[PDB]
């Protein structure tokens, strides 16, 4: 899998995303407070963060390519297309920035 370092408000951890599971599966696996939702992309409020490395979510709701590459993301629908860190909580950062990065 791909390390990816979850950025969660409580602090950080690596966990292992496969290339075709997304990441929440390794993230909760890992010990995150991170929620669980539909799996599915029903929604983004559980829009994690690329803080590093990269993700799959092209098909993400009403984030964008260039989102991503300001690293917003998505947790539902999306895994690591390389060994990144994602923040989590900050869903917020796709619909205005959050001043993260
Ligand atoms: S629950 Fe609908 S996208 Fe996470």
Same mark, same amino acid.
């Given at each position: 899998? $791909?390390? !990816?370092? =979850?950025?969660?408000?409580? &602090?950080?951890?690596?966990? #292992?995303?496969?290339? %075709?599971? $997304?990441? =929440? *599966?390794?993230? #909760? #696996?890992?010990?995150? %407070?991170?929620? $669980?939702?539909?799996?599915? /992309?029903?929604?983004?409020?559980?829009? &994690?963060? !690329?803080?590093?490395?990269? !993700? *799959?979510?092209?098909?993400?709701?009403?984030? *964008? *390519?260039?989102?991503? /590459?300001? &690293?917003? !993301?998505?947790?539902?629908?999306? $895994?690591?297309?390389? %060994?990144?860190?994602?923040?989590?909580?900050?869903? #917020?950062? =796709?619909?205005?920035?959050?001043?993260?990065?």
């Amino acid at each position: 899998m $791909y390390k !990816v370092t =979850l950025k969660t408000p409580s &602090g950080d951890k690596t966990i #292992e995303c496969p290339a %075709d599971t $997304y990441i =929440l *599966d390794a993230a #909760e #696996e890992a010990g995150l %407070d991170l929620p $669980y939702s539909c799996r599915a /992309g029903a929604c983004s409020s559980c829009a &994690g963060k !690329v803080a590093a490395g990269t !993700v *799959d979510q092209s098909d993400q709701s009403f984030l *964008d *390519d260039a989102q991503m /590459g300001n &690293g917003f !993301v998505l947790t539902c629908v999306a $895994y690591p297309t390389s %060994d990144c860190t994602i923040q989590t909580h900050q869903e #917020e950062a =796709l619909y205005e920035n959050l001043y993260f990065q």
